[model samples]
Target: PVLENVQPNSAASKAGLQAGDRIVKVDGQPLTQWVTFVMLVRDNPGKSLALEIERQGSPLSLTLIPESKPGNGKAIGFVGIEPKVI
Candidate 1:
């Protein structure tokens, strides 16, 4: 999925993600769905993630630490990014 927004000062923005960047994989694992990416992000809080993204047809790698936030009786990770709808 393509990133539509990177919230300023958030993990995604801080990690240098820009709008229009397409997420190809995470932590060396290929991504087939957007929700899988979301689930990966949500499952790990405060952990460094290795992201593979395509920017202008070029593959790039980025490392980001998800912010820990309150969830359903547990803490979940958030990067403050919005995905482009298909």
Candidate 2:
């Protein structure tokens, strides 16, 4: 899925994530829907990730770390990015 609304200085931004970038895979798993990506990021707080993305039809690689956030006494991961509708 495409990425949008990347926050400045946030984990996503720090990892060089930009709006319009389309993530094709996470870790070693292929991405076909936004929900799967969301669940992966949310479930693994503070875990390092390897992301495969496409920018301008060219494949790219990125190392990402989801920031940990408090969630009902449990920690959840956040990358400060929103999915773009395209």
Candidate 3:
């Protein structure tokens, strides 16, 4: 995983997240993979996420609300972010 890339109009982006931001904790839990990240994001749709993000040598505590992305003709919770490098 690498730097953050938040989709425009997504909950993450609206929450003040930006590309190159570092995610240190998700709801107080450290992460390892994107799959696990997605699963947790999906698991907590509409719930507020407590994130510890490191940005430009500054730390922040943000509240991100996960939304659903329509896929396979149904709603799937989504945290619209990706890594530029893997």
Candidate 4:
């Protein structure tokens, strides 16, 4: 199971993901249930990712990314605010 790389100073960090964490699902959708995370990422482009993850044997929920684009024109959604974890 490959993990998605957390963007630096991005939502994934503010949401509280340290290295070695495993994502289990997004918005109630299981990770393995999808063909690829990119599929989910693409579909969710600009949408917030409600994530279920495991870290240090604990399960937790966090907002992965904002469904909007940062000033650089790269983002999952069109919200205009830069995605940050938490």
Better of 2 and 4 by TM-score: 2
Error (Å) of candidate 3 at residue 73 is 6.0
- Top TM-score: which candidate number? 1
Q: Where does model 3 exceed 4 Å of error?
A: none
Residues 9-80 of candidate 2 have per-residue lDDT tens digits of 788998888998999998878888889989988998778889999989999899889898898878899899
Tell me model 1's lDDT, rounded to 2 decimals.
Answer: 0.90
Task: Kindly list the per-residue Cα lDDT of model 4 for residues 17-75, writing each as its tens digit.
Answer: 65567778878978885345555654465456788888878898877554445536544
**Candidate 3 weakest lDDT stretch, 10 residues:** 31-40
Query: In candidate 1, what are the lDDT values of residues 6-82, reduced to their tens digit?
Result: 99989999888999999888888888889988987899888899999999999999998889789989999999998
lDDT of 3 by residue, 58-83 (tens): 98998989998776766777867876
Highest lDDT: give the candidate number: 1
Q: What's the lDDT of the predicted structure labeled candidate 2?
A: 0.88
Candidates' C-alpha lDDT: 0.90, 0.88, 0.78, 0.58
Q: Would you list the rank order by lDDT, best first? A: 1, 2, 3, 4
Model 4 worst lDDT window (10 residues): 77-86
The candidates, ranked best first by TM-score, are: 1, 2, 3, 4
